[PDB]
Amino acid sequence: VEPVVVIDGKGHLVGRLASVVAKQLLNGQKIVVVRAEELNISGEFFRNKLKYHDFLRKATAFNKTRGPFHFRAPSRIFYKALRGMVSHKTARGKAALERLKVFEGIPPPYDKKKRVVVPQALRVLRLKPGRKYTTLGKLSTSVGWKYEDVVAKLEAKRKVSSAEYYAKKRAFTKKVASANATAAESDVAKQLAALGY
Amino acid sequence: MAHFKEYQVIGRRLPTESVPEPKLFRMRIFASNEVIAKSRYWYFLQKLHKVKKASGEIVSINQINEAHPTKVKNFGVWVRYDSRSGTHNMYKEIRDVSRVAAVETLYQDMAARHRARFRSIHILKVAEIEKTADVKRQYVKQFLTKDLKFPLPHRVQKSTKTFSYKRPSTFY
Amino acid sequence: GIDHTSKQHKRSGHRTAPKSDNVYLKLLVKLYTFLARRTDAPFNKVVLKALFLSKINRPPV
Amino acid sequence: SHRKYEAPRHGHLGFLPRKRAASIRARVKAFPKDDRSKPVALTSFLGY
Amino acid sequence: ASLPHPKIVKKHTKKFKRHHSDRYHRVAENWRKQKGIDSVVRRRFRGNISQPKIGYGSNKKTKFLSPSGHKTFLVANVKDLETLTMHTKTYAAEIAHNISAKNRVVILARAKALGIKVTNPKGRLAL
Amino acid sequence: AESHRLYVKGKHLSYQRSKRVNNPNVSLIKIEGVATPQDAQFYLGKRIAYVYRASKEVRGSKIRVMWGKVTRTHGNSGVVRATFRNNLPAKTFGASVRIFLYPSNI
RNA sequence: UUUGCUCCACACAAUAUAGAUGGAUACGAAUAAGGCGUCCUUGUGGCGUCGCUGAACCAUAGCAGGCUAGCAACGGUGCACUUGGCGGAAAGGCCUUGGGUGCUUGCUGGCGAAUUGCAAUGUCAUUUUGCGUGGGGAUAAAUCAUUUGUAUACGACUUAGA
RNA sequence: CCCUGAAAAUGGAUGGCGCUCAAGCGUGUUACCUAUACUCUACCGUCAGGGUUGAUAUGAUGCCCUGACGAGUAGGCAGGCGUGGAGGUCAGUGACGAAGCCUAGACCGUAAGGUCGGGUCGAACGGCCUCUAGUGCAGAUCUUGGUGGUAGUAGCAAAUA
RNA sequence: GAACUGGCGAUGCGGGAUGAACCGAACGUAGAGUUAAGGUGCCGGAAUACACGCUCAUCAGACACCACAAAAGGUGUUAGU
RNA sequence: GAAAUUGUUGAAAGGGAAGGGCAUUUGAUCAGACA
């Protein structure tokens, strides 16, 4: 239903948010997950790091290279598991993988711009309260992701150079309210709420 | 099994020149249809008496209704599940509106907690309790209290679309 | 599919025309036919069958 | 089979692609951590 | 110049190649019911060639008809041409390849004095 | 105005296909919006047109068309089925799709 | 080496489109909680209120949006000038003053639209490149051959040379 | 149901991703997807039953009507296709170009194969009824002849120059 | 290595990921529709359906043939006698 | 003067083979039909 689509991962579920974005995809829906470092997952932090732990040993013997590359970088990760669900190795694949970007933290050509959520893939509606969960945030750290604190600074920022976008969009829309009741009893505004509106 | 219907099935033991008027056996059944029923019927008599679908015959097969469906009753129920091993008896209690949940709900419960099936459960007897207290297991007694009230916390709402604009909420 | 019930595509297993190639045997058969179709009497059905027959089955009399 | 005699490897794994570095000058792969008080200075120096 | 027949449906337009043909230079595209005990084409498995079988025939009505809807006929000389005279809507002509150029234009000409369509009037035209 | 559109927007998802065998004759429709089999019932019979663009101009245009139509509800979602004169082309899985409003009934 | 090259223009040819066909419409945090307004001791404060899905909100009438006349308003918005600021996470965008000027559907009119013949996407997007007219700008390297040996199987490397 | 008990050798496998009031387990209700199966229709074939000598248009082994069936190695039968030569025939094609050969040009047949457009070429050769055979090839470490990739490679370095 | 039948070999087709033999069902060429066995988060056509329960596993579990696990223990939790 | 097999030319394709099936699309190429 649009040309692009900026999701904000936060409060997500790799896993689920996971799909939807692969599905989409295969249906022409350029998507652009952000923020991510704040992903999420079923399971006590510990694991997963256990989980993680493996898809790590799995190598190639005979040349550790040319083998299954273990990215770290929240991003990448989400990615992957996204991916897995998009048949790449064909063309329609790929023509799929392009459509999708991904970053941890909302950079620019997006911090603008709006973002959304994916309900059906929000922790906070999948789980039941009490079950422990994760935070790709840690995870990534912990298996080595140099950069989590450099994001977590550029966050402190833009959570502002936003707010102060805000307390300014909001003192506006409010006058428009104390200058929108002078003119409306007007004639135009009673016929109106008969059709509706 | 499916959804049930109480049933009254009044078999015989085929008449003979010898023993005319061969005594009539009633059984309240908790089945899916009158094919069940006439089945679920003979299975139980070939355990108390010397008859079968042959030396027999089914006289009547009457759906029975609840009297007061509306009316929330407290059904104790008795049950003989087989297990994997031996066989066991039970006395579960199930707060419900009519028989024909008391047996449905039960079978789901005997499934989930004990991994039995319809195959392996005999619903010995069912009995609307009249007075509270004859009620004996805390997961009913929980609900028969002074002006009862509770919230439904963490309300999750159900959407159709894929995307949304707000980031929800679970107030109620 | 169809438990065939009986072999499918049984060829009669009786001659239908004469195996011979004696113009003459054929003109007869041709008359003979016409002669079980448009009549009823049976006589004809039987000289028809007999005309197609092979050598061994038409012994000398 | 098994080695028989369990001897060690020949050579260190962490110096591989054993190759023709790049340049004749070596990039300093990592400079010292920062203080940020100290006053300003050069952490390195080119000889011969 | 047709006899208002049905539609000319063909069934299987594509050529029936022989299994392997592509792979070999030795094995023609001319069709070969495979007799192999391993053969994937015999055991028709998916996912290979179809083999030719009945099945594919073409309606008795439109058999041996160009698309026009005429059946073609080989015409070596002009006597030849003069059996089609009557059946112009059903039949057609095709002049043989092994005719001189002077005897073509004659047949050509004889064609049209009687309405008849030929399917190779190009032939060997000094053009 | 700025809007002209007096087609419904919507996408070419598929071939009918089982897990591993597909049927180019039938095609599947993501009508942007339509979520149930009802919502789809409206767009049976209504026409479709994967439009696209060849380089070499025909026939006087740069622009070509394949004439759906929509024919039935596909399961829960008001994806729908969707012979076309010619079968859509696969490269099209994810391409935009003009459901029209004619063969009208309003 | 054929008077090339660079930037902005526009003219014409092409060449594509994993797929414009009104608008990707900007808090942050918690969800066993918050938003928005308001009062106050500025606090995890009091009071009111909303959700219970964007089915929202913005834009939206004029030959694919023509030529024209007024009334009410001093607003809205396009286009190009320019003052001053913000932003580096991929900034390559966002806001704002002061004008120059259109269209104004805020209310009232008047002409034109036909025959594209009962539908045929009925073509108004944005890709990259090429050839010339015309408005500003600039005026180089590298490879071989030769040479060095911190280098070297050969290529590569490292130096040297009007 | 979880858990301990539960130790094998490249890296890793509920098929994979992933999944936790499940995308797990047990059970119940519907909707839905989809095989060359089933239903209906078209077309092909075989097989079974039937109808049609009245001369007088074209085939009485013909022309029709009705039905049911269609997998196949080994194996059997049937109808065709093609090749060398022989009797007959078309007073057949032909130096105004026969045979052959090349042709991501056309048409016909389910097919074997047929016919034809264009080029090349230079002396003989097709349909039809029939007789006859040293008659159809991808394979036999088949025969004989040719030619590749290997590859501008191995290598051309003993005997003082 | 025997018995009864059904398979495969001689048999594709959809399903069990994959596989002679298991489950569906046995084949002329095509068109519509309905299903079987299997399924319906995404690879993938199809409910991130509905309903009631159990389960958190610092080696969870996941579906017949089938590619495993036991005796024995647990104030981990759930019904029971 | 056939094929293997080579050489210019022209067209096209090519991320660890190639080729084949059903289906359309585009690019090149062609038959007939219409009167």
Tab-separated table of C-alpha atoms in Angstrom, chain B residues 13-171:
chain	number	residue	atom	x	y	z
B	13	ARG	CA	-31.335	-57.660	23.306
B	14	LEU	CA	-33.490	-58.882	20.400
B	15	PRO	CA	-36.893	-60.304	21.400
B	16	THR	CA	-37.332	-64.062	21.680
B	17	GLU	CA	-40.303	-67.006	21.146
B	18	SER	CA	-38.718	-68.313	24.382
B	19	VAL	CA	-38.220	-64.377	26.472
B	20	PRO	CA	-40.558	-61.660	25.192
B	21	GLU	CA	-40.285	-58.205	26.797
B	22	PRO	CA	-36.485	-58.392	27.378
B	23	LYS	CA	-35.899	-55.955	30.280
B	24	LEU	CA	-34.474	-51.863	28.018
B	25	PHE	CA	-31.286	-49.998	28.829
B	26	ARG	CA	-30.937	-46.228	28.929
B	27	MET	CA	-27.612	-44.456	28.434
B	28	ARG	CA	-26.887	-40.721	28.308
B	29	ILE	CA	-24.177	-40.301	25.646
B	30	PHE	CA	-21.621	-37.549	25.007
B	31	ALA	CA	-21.363	-37.753	21.040
B	32	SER	CA	-21.260	-35.931	17.695
B	33	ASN	CA	-24.222	-37.577	15.928
B	34	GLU	CA	-27.007	-40.168	15.994
B	35	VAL	CA	-24.075	-42.934	14.191
B	36	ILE	CA	-21.511	-42.036	16.883
B	37	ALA	CA	-24.253	-42.255	19.583
B	38	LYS	CA	-25.684	-45.637	18.489
B	39	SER	CA	-22.081	-46.631	18.543
B	40	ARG	CA	-20.652	-45.158	21.725
B	41	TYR	CA	-24.146	-47.048	22.937
B	42	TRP	CA	-23.151	-50.645	22.124
B	43	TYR	CA	-19.519	-50.213	23.232
B	44	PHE	CA	-20.639	-49.745	26.828
B	45	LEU	CA	-23.170	-52.606	26.908
B	46	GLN	CA	-20.576	-55.103	25.663
B	47	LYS	CA	-18.989	-54.488	29.094
B	48	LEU	CA	-21.989	-54.764	31.382
B	49	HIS	CA	-24.285	-57.231	29.559
B	50	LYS	CA	-24.178	-60.091	27.037
B	51	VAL	CA	-25.317	-58.415	23.821
B	52	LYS	CA	-23.939	-56.728	20.723
B	53	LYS	CA	-24.949	-54.864	17.569
B	54	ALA	CA	-26.342	-58.138	16.205
B	55	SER	CA	-27.691	-59.982	19.550
B	56	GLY	CA	-29.317	-56.548	19.864
B	57	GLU	CA	-31.481	-53.417	18.906
B	58	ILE	CA	-31.719	-49.657	19.355
B	59	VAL	CA	-35.249	-48.688	20.318
B	60	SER	CA	-34.995	-44.902	20.717
B	61	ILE	CA	-32.224	-42.369	20.140
B	62	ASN	CA	-33.339	-39.150	21.839
B	63	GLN	CA	-31.438	-35.673	21.271
B	64	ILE	CA	-31.733	-34.483	24.853
B	65	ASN	CA	-31.603	-30.297	25.677
B	66	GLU	CA	-29.778	-28.059	28.683
B	67	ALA	CA	-33.137	-27.582	30.448
B	68	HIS	CA	-31.414	-23.992	31.779
B	69	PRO	CA	-28.752	-23.111	29.170
B	70	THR	CA	-28.900	-19.325	29.524
B	71	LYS	CA	-27.923	-20.370	33.809
B	72	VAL	CA	-24.251	-20.844	34.713
B	73	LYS	CA	-23.874	-24.124	36.613
B	74	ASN	CA	-21.037	-26.262	38.876
B	75	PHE	CA	-20.353	-29.457	36.941
B	76	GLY	CA	-18.613	-32.124	39.259
B	77	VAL	CA	-17.401	-34.606	36.676
B	78	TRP	CA	-16.170	-38.462	37.108
B	79	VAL	CA	-13.751	-39.980	34.585
B	80	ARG	CA	-12.098	-43.353	33.950
B	81	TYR	CA	-8.747	-42.089	31.577
B	82	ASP	CA	-6.672	-45.147	30.214
B	83	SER	CA	-3.176	-43.681	30.481
B	84	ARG	CA	0.402	-44.964	28.512
B	85	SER	CA	0.585	-47.622	31.214
B	86	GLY	CA	-2.532	-48.497	33.938
B	87	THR	CA	-6.006	-46.998	34.075
B	88	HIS	CA	-7.088	-44.298	36.520
B	89	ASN	CA	-10.240	-42.712	37.862
B	90	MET	CA	-10.822	-38.977	38.378
B	91	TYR	CA	-13.114	-36.258	39.680
B	92	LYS	CA	-12.648	-32.993	37.817
B	93	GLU	CA	-14.806	-29.917	38.225
B	94	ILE	CA	-15.710	-27.569	35.420
B	95	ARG	CA	-17.623	-24.331	35.724
B	96	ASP	CA	-19.725	-24.031	32.586
B	97	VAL	CA	-23.068	-22.970	31.234
B	98	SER	CA	-24.467	-26.314	29.982
B	99	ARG	CA	-23.915	-30.769	30.006
B	100	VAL	CA	-22.951	-30.644	26.380
B	101	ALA	CA	-19.469	-28.012	27.533
B	102	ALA	CA	-18.854	-29.754	30.862
B	103	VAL	CA	-18.131	-32.721	28.247
B	104	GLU	CA	-16.336	-30.777	25.497
B	105	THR	CA	-14.084	-28.436	27.570
B	106	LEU	CA	-13.574	-31.848	29.705
B	107	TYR	CA	-12.136	-33.829	26.772
B	108	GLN	CA	-9.824	-30.929	25.805
B	109	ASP	CA	-8.523	-30.828	29.383
B	110	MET	CA	-8.056	-34.618	29.613
B	111	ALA	CA	-6.249	-34.484	26.264
B	112	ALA	CA	-4.095	-31.402	27.416
B	113	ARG	CA	-2.938	-32.395	30.896
B	114	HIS	CA	-2.845	-36.188	30.401
B	115	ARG	CA	-2.455	-36.836	26.666
B	116	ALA	CA	-5.544	-39.002	26.366
B	117	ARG	CA	-8.025	-38.949	23.480
B	118	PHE	CA	-11.736	-39.615	22.924
B	119	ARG	CA	-10.865	-43.275	22.308
B	120	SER	CA	-9.476	-43.416	25.941
B	121	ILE	CA	-11.918	-41.752	28.339
B	122	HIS	CA	-15.213	-42.835	29.891
B	123	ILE	CA	-17.361	-39.916	31.124
B	124	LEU	CA	-18.605	-42.251	34.289
B	125	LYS	CA	-21.208	-39.684	35.327
B	126	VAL	CA	-21.880	-35.925	35.256
B	127	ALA	CA	-23.333	-33.940	38.169
B	128	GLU	CA	-25.027	-30.292	38.109
B	129	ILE	CA	-23.437	-29.381	41.845
B	130	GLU	CA	-26.354	-27.710	43.659
B	131	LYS	CA	-24.543	-25.979	46.527
B	132	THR	CA	-21.082	-24.397	46.705
B	133	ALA	CA	-18.379	-25.506	49.188
B	134	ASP	CA	-19.952	-29.421	47.637
B	135	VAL	CA	-17.639	-27.766	45.077
B	136	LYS	CA	-13.575	-29.227	46.325
B	137	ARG	CA	-10.828	-27.906	44.056
B	138	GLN	CA	-9.361	-24.439	44.314
B	139	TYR	CA	-9.482	-23.591	40.576
B	140	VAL	CA	-13.280	-23.322	40.876
B	141	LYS	CA	-14.028	-22.450	44.538
B	142	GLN	CA	-11.332	-19.078	43.078
B	143	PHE	CA	-14.510	-17.843	41.366
B	144	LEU	CA	-18.162	-18.421	44.587
B	145	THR	CA	-16.791	-15.107	45.886
B	146	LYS	CA	-18.303	-11.897	47.281
B	147	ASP	CA	-19.292	-9.494	44.458
B	148	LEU	CA	-16.633	-10.625	41.993
B	149	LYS	CA	-14.003	-8.360	39.935
B	150	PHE	CA	-10.907	-8.348	37.787
B	151	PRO	CA	-9.085	-6.537	34.987
B	152	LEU	CA	-7.964	-7.947	31.660
B	153	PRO	CA	-4.439	-6.464	31.644
B	154	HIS	CA	-2.121	-6.215	28.645
B	155	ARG	CA	-4.929	-5.959	26.098
B	156	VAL	CA	-3.694	-6.894	22.613
B	157	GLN	CA	-5.180	-5.040	19.885
B	158	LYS	CA	-5.687	-7.211	16.790
B	159	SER	CA	-5.023	-5.548	13.428
B	160	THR	CA	-5.761	-6.940	9.962
B	161	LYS	CA	-3.064	-4.261	7.982
B	162	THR	CA	0.658	-5.060	7.717
B	163	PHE	CA	1.706	-1.601	8.819
B	164	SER	CA	1.301	0.769	11.592
B	165	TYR	CA	1.334	4.492	12.313
B	166	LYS	CA	1.113	4.744	16.078
B	167	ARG	CA	3.139	2.181	18.002
B	168	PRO	CA	0.613	0.739	20.407
B	169	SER	CA	-1.689	0.494	23.017
B	170	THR	CA	-2.012	-2.055	26.025
B	171	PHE	CA	-4.324	0.015	28.240
